[PDB]
Write an enzyme that holds these catalytic residues in place. Structure first.
Site, mmCIF file in Angstrom:
data_model
loop_
_atom_site.group_PDB
_atom_site.id
_atom_site.type_symbol
_atom_site.label_atom_id
_atom_site.label_comp_id
_atom_site.label_asym_id
_atom_site.label_seq_id
_atom_site.Cartn_x
_atom_site.Cartn_y
_atom_site.Cartn_z
ATOM 1 N N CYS A 109 0.833 -1.205 0.000
ATOM 2 C CA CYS A 109 0.000 0.000 0.000
ATOM 3 C C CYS A 109 0.865 1.251 0.000
ATOM 4 C CB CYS A 109 -0.955 0.037 1.200
ATOM 5 S SG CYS A 109 -1.847 1.596 1.200
ATOM 6 N N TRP A 281 -9.079 6.205 -0.875
ATOM 7 C CA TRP A 281 -9.390 6.885 -2.119
ATOM 8 C C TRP A 281 -8.433 6.381 -3.170
ATOM 9 C CZ3 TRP A 281 -8.230 9.654 2.326
ATOM 10 C CH2 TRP A 281 -6.914 10.125 2.445
ATOM 11 N N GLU A 286 -4.727 3.670 -10.822
ATOM 12 C CA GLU A 286 -5.524 2.467 -10.618
ATOM 13 C C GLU A 286 -6.642 2.384 -11.642
ATOM 14 O OE1 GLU A 286 -6.356 1.227 -6.543
ATOM 15 O OE2 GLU A 286 -5.799 3.309 -5.995
HETATM 16 C C1 HEM Z 1 -6.215 6.566 1.865
HETATM 17 C C2 HEM Z 1 -5.782 6.449 0.608
HETATM 18 C C3 HEM Z 1 -5.198 5.141 0.037
HETATM 19 C C4 HEM Z 1 -4.500 5.082 -1.110
HETATM 20 C C5 HEM Z 1 -4.153 6.270 -2.040
HETATM 21 C C6 HEM Z 1 -4.094 3.702 -1.316
HETATM 22 C C7 HEM Z 1 -3.372 3.228 -2.384
HETATM 23 C C8 HEM Z 1 -3.151 1.895 -2.658
HETATM 24 C C9 HEM Z 1 -2.805 1.334 -3.943
HETATM 25 C C10 HEM Z 1 -2.622 2.158 -5.232
HETATM 26 C C11 HEM Z 1 -2.667 0.007 -3.797
HETATM 27 C C12 HEM Z 1 -2.322 -1.007 -4.906
HETATM 28 C C13 HEM Z 1 -3.588 -1.839 -5.067
HETATM 29 C C14 HEM Z 1 -3.683 -2.366 -6.460
HETATM 30 O O1 HEM Z 1 -2.888 -1.931 -7.321
HETATM 31 O O2 HEM Z 1 -4.578 -3.216 -6.686
HETATM 32 C C15 HEM Z 1 -2.945 -0.325 -2.405
HETATM 33 C C16 HEM Z 1 -2.910 -1.574 -1.818
HETATM 34 C C17 HEM Z 1 -3.341 -1.898 -0.532
HETATM 35 N N1 HEM Z 1 -3.956 -1.045 0.362
HETATM 36 FE FE1 HEM Z 1 -3.839 0.997 0.209
HETATM 37 N N2 HEM Z 1 -4.585 2.937 -0.275
HETATM 38 C C18 HEM Z 1 -5.265 3.790 0.590
HETATM 39 C C19 HEM Z 1 -5.917 3.384 1.745
HETATM 40 C C20 HEM Z 1 -5.873 2.131 2.312
HETATM 41 C C21 HEM Z 1 -6.559 1.742 3.532
HETATM 42 C C22 HEM Z 1 -7.452 2.732 4.301
HETATM 43 C C23 HEM Z 1 -6.266 0.449 3.789
HETATM 44 C C24 HEM Z 1 -6.683 -0.490 4.931
HETATM 45 C C25 HEM Z 1 -7.400 -0.067 5.986
HETATM 46 C C26 HEM Z 1 -5.387 -0.007 2.730
HETATM 47 C C27 HEM Z 1 -4.849 -1.263 2.634
HETATM 48 C C28 HEM Z 1 -4.218 -1.755 1.518
HETATM 49 C C29 HEM Z 1 -3.746 -3.101 1.334
HETATM 50 C C30 HEM Z 1 -3.834 -4.223 2.386
HETATM 51 C C31 HEM Z 1 -3.216 -3.185 0.110
HETATM 52 C C32 HEM Z 1 -2.566 -4.442 -0.517
HETATM 53 C C33 HEM Z 1 -3.665 -5.150 -1.290
HETATM 54 C C34 HEM Z 1 -3.101 -6.361 -1.979
HETATM 55 O O3 HEM Z 1 -2.050 -6.893 -1.528
HETATM 56 O O4 HEM Z 1 -3.725 -6.805 -2.973
HETATM 57 N N3 HEM Z 1 -5.167 1.041 1.860
HETATM 58 N N4 HEM Z 1 -3.234 0.857 -1.754
HETATM 59 N N1 LIG Z 2 -7.552 -10.376 -10.510
HETATM 60 C C1 LIG Z 2 -6.357 -10.339 -10.916
HETATM 61 N N2 LIG Z 2 -5.368 -10.549 -10.046
HETATM 62 C C2 LIG Z 2 -5.413 -9.891 -8.866
HETATM 63 C C3 LIG Z 2 -5.372 -10.571 -7.648
HETATM 64 C C4 LIG Z 2 -5.424 -9.849 -6.457
HETATM 65 C C5 LIG Z 2 -5.522 -8.456 -6.496
HETATM 66 C C6 LIG Z 2 -5.588 -7.634 -5.232
HETATM 67 C C7 LIG Z 2 -5.977 -6.202 -5.586
HETATM 68 N N3 LIG Z 2 -6.608 -5.565 -4.420
HETATM 69 C C8 LIG Z 2 -7.490 -4.464 -4.856
HETATM 70 C C9 LIG Z 2 -7.089 -3.234 -4.080
HETATM 71 C C10 LIG Z 2 -6.470 -3.449 -2.864
HETATM 72 C C11 LIG Z 2 -6.087 -2.363 -2.098
HETATM 73 C C12 LIG Z 2 -6.282 -1.079 -2.583
HETATM 74 C C13 LIG Z 2 -6.913 -0.836 -3.800
HETATM 75 N N4 LIG Z 2 -7.097 0.445 -4.246
HETATM 76 C C14 LIG Z 2 -7.364 1.470 -3.414
HETATM 77 N N5 LIG Z 2 -7.046 2.660 -3.689
HETATM 78 C C15 LIG Z 2 -8.061 1.197 -2.117
HETATM 79 N N6 LIG Z 2 -9.017 0.322 -1.744
HETATM 80 C C16 LIG Z 2 -9.352 0.406 -0.412
HETATM 81 C C17 LIG Z 2 -8.656 1.355 0.340
HETATM 82 S S1 LIG Z 2 -7.577 2.132 -0.759
HETATM 83 C C18 LIG Z 2 -7.319 -1.939 -4.550
HETATM 84 C C19 LIG Z 2 -5.565 -7.789 -7.713
HETATM 85 C C20 LIG Z 2 -5.509 -8.505 -8.897
HETATM 86 C C21 LIG Z 2 -6.074 -10.030 -12.353
HETATM 87 N N7 LIG Z 2 -5.357 -9.082 -13.010
HETATM 88 C C22 LIG Z 2 -5.404 -9.202 -14.379
HETATM 89 C C23 LIG Z 2 -6.171 -10.253 -14.882
HETATM 90 S S2 LIG Z 2 -6.819 -11.073 -13.506
#
Ligand code: HEM
Ligand SMILES: N=C(Nc1ccc(CCNCc2cccc(NC(=N)c3nccs3)c2)cc1)c1nccs1
Ligand code: HEM
Ligand SMILES: N=C(Nc1ccc(CCNCc2cccc(NC(=N)c3nccs3)c2)cc1)c1nccs1
Ligand SMILES: C[C@H](O)[C@H](O)[C@H]1CNc2nc(N)[nH]c(=O)c2N1
Ligand SMILES: C[C@H](O)[C@H](O)[C@H]1CNc2nc(N)[nH]c(=O)c2N1
Ligand SMILES: [Zn+2]
Lengths: 411, 411
Positions: A109, A281, A286
């Site tokens: 994150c 947000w 993204e």
């Molecule tokens: C407040 C503004 C926030 C921004 C700008 C932000 C940004 C991001 C981005 C760009 C990613 C990459 C996710 C992806 O590419 O699919 C990410 C991952 C993640 N965010 Fe943040 N996030 C925010 C808030 C939060 C909050 C509030 C939480 C939890 C309470 C959180 C927990 C996580 C986690 C656990 C991941 C890893 C997800 C994974 O491994 O798939 N984020 N975040």
């Molecule tokens: N499903 C696929 N793999 C795949 C497996 C796992 C994941 C995990 C992605 N967690 C979504 C995610 C997690 C955390 C943050 C964001 N964003 C945000 N700003 C926020 N949300 C909440 C607070 S901040 C979005 C993503 C992709 C595939 N990719 C291509 C073809 S299949």
């Protein structure tokens, strides 16, 4: 045992000792690095107390009462409750601390500079799907805050035996449907085609269009999941326009303002919260890069490049790159002009470097996953590209978990 | 013990068994991933023979004579030579095999689809700096090939005791000087300011301009290094123009056609070649993104964005991104229009996926460093972004080594 991470654009060197407190494993070994593997890899009463003590020791350490009387009493209190029920219950304070530090510890994150400004909604009293719907709606409303987005997490009851799991079956509270076509293509969002059909299975009446907000599939206390439609007035959407190109409206793109991940597992002190939707947000890329331009998603590079009158014959005209930047200028402009919170990858990555400096200073390190921290475009003109990051697993944490339909004993 | 890597844009799954043959360590452990650390971390006769046998076993395995008579005789031949001299000498064939497989094994190299088309120049008979100059000039001429660039490596004598090292002190055979200013800024290439002054120290007469090709500082058989000027007719340069923007010529940018790394160490069968300059051709982003737009390099995003009349007030106008794409369109166009070999990041990364498929099929895997394989811009619109890659260290290999001036006993 006191590792150094260097920034190669500023020559700033930081010393990591926080990784000594690391617990879980990474997937890497001394002989193979798995840092680009996407998904690396009931709980008994015996294993539970060290996990609880470890958590309680850092909790009381953080409120300046490590080893004090209230610490030892709570330590014994939790031990006694783990003896009795083979589990235990967090204090509201401990729950809020745990959630914030799960976010603080999320090495993938880039947003974590905000980790302590997190609104924790305790839904551990929820018992039914309708109660989940209700809690989730209030989360959406609160977090969205008329576009002045506010980070929040809603925490449903912890796992017990395993067969009484609270799960949100959606990957995100708000996401667009994906339907395949007769000609085998895809309308909407290909990412959610399987989930979109599960809703149609459990009874959704799909409006088979593009940006169709999916219903909520909510599973409470292990029962079969149930459909609920988020009130459309709670779902803030941004129409995507460009500040230069007026055909960009004709694209008719739009996205939702609130990224709210709902399929992850929150671990606090060995306790497992299988339904813990959290929202913050968006960072612009993204939507503009991954959502809109992944070949396996909306995949709009074709059309945008067409309307820009781009040399699409040669791969080396960089027409994909040029259309990619225009698309992300449009996402940012549309969100900002609409007063919907969004951060560009330049601001967010600069903040993450500043966040890293804070954590190395006041915490001894910051676990960080370079593969995920660096944005999907313009990598090296952002400061995180040039920032060495040590990745390691700290707890409390957010974990992946199986999709509920692959594990749920149905009926 | 038979690990799977997945592509998340194609769902293609590959099984890696080649990592079982991996030898050296990665820097990662089970508890910490170092995959974004830039530099992770004499040789006795005892350690030398297993390294030689290991190499000879794969060499003879590759020419379909593993365990044969010529294999065992060469095994005994090398053992006997290691007993006598506490080192040994590769056959010309073994040297060519070793070099190609060092490139084949370079997990940070996206170009490896070409790994077997490599021209190996044996300079192990070289004894003086002038002989190094001569070999290097012929390497430049051959590799450049009038712009139809050809991959080549020139291999100077192997390390012996350690005090008789052949070293090219340049980081690349061809690179631009960097001088600081009176007003503390920098003219030319900030990357080479220290090296540029070492040449001025050893006697260079610097033409204190921008794109000034540095002299060669060549160290032979451990002696002090000596300056040589590459004949300008051997140094092919490309003036950088844009196919749309005619002010782009006014930028007056140019770059050299031949990337030829000269500061790395080639390890073959435990033998150490401390001077082994190797060249291929450029992927466009190396020049247009890193060379031209790193804050610590030429850093031209300011000027390009100015001349494009870009909103440079707000970070979120993505003016840096927009100028970045224009710059890389210009590098590619200039090189191609000049018939100087270059590959765009789309073609090169697609080829690396295809290269990966080959290696997993005919070799059991392909060591690959995602942090380095993914280009510094447009990451996720290239296929390597979505490709899980296992990184591990196979030998023969290219290794980093100290800069010679930090280690060389001078005089
Ligand atoms: C407040 C503004 C926030 C921004 C700008 C932000 C940004 C991001 C981005 C760009 C990613 C990459 C996710 C992806 O590419 O699919 C990410 C991952 C993640 N965010 Fe943040 N996030 C925010 C808030 C939060 C909050 C509030 C939480 C939890 C309470 C959180 C927990 C996580 C986690 C656990 C991941 C890893 C997800 C994974 O491994 O798939 N984020 N975040
Ligand atoms: N499903 C696929 N793999 C795949 C497996 C796992 C994941 C995990 C992605 N967690 C979504 C995610 C997690 C955390 C943050 C964001 N964003 C945000 N700003 C926020 N949300 C909440 C607070 S901040 C979005 C993503 C992709 C595939 N990719 C291509 C073809 S299949
Ligand atoms: C033929 C066309 C080639 C292309 C397009 C290519 C491309 C690249 C690129 C873009 C990098 C990243 C370097 C950086 O960002 O600084 C790289 C690294 C590397 N290349 Fe290749 N290369 C080619 C040929 C070769 C050859 C012929 C060799 C050796 C004989 C080689 C060995 C390496 C090594 C060892 C690295 C890693 C360097 C490091 O770790 O710093 N490459 N290559
Ligand atoms: N010096 C810095 N760190 C740093 C440390 C080590 C390195 C190693 C870079 N090897 C250069 C290199 C290596 C391999 C390939 C290329 N390219 C090419 N196409 C080819 N050549 C030859 C054949 S193909 C270029 C690079 C940077 C700094 N960065 C910012 C401020 S300081
Ligand atoms: C193979 C690779 O691990 C996978 O594509 C990762 C790369 N880095 C990423 N980084 C972010 N933020 N989000 C992602 O989905 C991915 N995908
Ligand atoms: C900190 C990080 O490891 C460093 O900036 C790396 C990132 N990836 C890279 N990838 C390539 N090809 N070249 C580089 O110089 C770097 N630099
Ligand atoms: Zn690792």
């Amino acid at each position: 045992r006191f590792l150094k991470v260097k920034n190669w654009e500023t020559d700033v060197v930081l010393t990591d000792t926080l990784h000594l407190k690391s617990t879980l494993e990474t997937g890497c070994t001394e002989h193979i690095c798995m840092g680009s593997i996407m998904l690396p890899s009931v709980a008994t009463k015996d294993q539970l107390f060290p996990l609880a003590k470890e958590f309680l020791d850092q909790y009381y350490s953080s409120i300046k009462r490590f080893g004090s009387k209230a610490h030892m009493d709570r330590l014994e209190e939790v031990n006694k409750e783990i003896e009795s029920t083979s589990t235990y219950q967090l204090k509201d304070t401990e729950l809020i601390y745990g959630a914030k530090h799960a976010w603080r510890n999320a090495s993938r994150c880039v947003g974590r500079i905000q980790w302590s400004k997190l609104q924790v909604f305790d839904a551990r009293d929820c018992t039914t799907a309708h109660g989940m719907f209700n809690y989730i709606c209030n989360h959406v409303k609160y977090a969205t805050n008329k576009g002045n987005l506010r980070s929040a997490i809603t925490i449903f009851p912890q796992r017990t035996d395993g067969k009484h799991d609270f799960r949100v079956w959606n990957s995100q509270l708000i996401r667009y449907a994906g339907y395949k076509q007769p000609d085998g293509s895809t309308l909407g969002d290909p990412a959610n085609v399987q989930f979109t059909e599960i809703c149609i299975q459990q009874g959704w009446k799909a409006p088979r269009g593009r940006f169709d907000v999916l219903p909520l599939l909510l599973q409470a206390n292990g029962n079969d999941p149930e459909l609920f439609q988020i009130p459309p007035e709670l779902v803030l959407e941004v129409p995507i326009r460009h500040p230069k190109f007026d055909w960009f409206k004709d694209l008719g793109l739009k996205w939702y303002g609130l990224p709210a991940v709902s399929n992850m597992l929150l671990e606090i002190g060995g306790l497992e919260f299988s339904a813990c939707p959290f929202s913050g947000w968006y960072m612009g890329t993204e939507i503009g890069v991954r959502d809109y331009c992944d070949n396996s998603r909306y995949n709009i590079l074709e059309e945008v490049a067409k309307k820009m009158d781009l040399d699409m014959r040669k791969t080396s005209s960089l027409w994909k790159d040029q259309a990619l930047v225009e698309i992300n200028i449009a996402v940012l402009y549309s969100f900002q002009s609409d007063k919907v919170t969004i951060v560009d990858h330049h601001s967010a990555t600069e903040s993450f470097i500043k966040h890293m400096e804070n954590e190395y200073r006041c915490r001894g390190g910051c676990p960080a996953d370079w593969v995920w921290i660096v944005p999907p475009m313009s990598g090296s003109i952002t400061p995180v590209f040039h920032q060495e990051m040590l990745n390691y697993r700290l707890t409390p944490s957010f974990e992946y978990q199986p999709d509920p339909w692959n594990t749920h004993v149905w009926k």
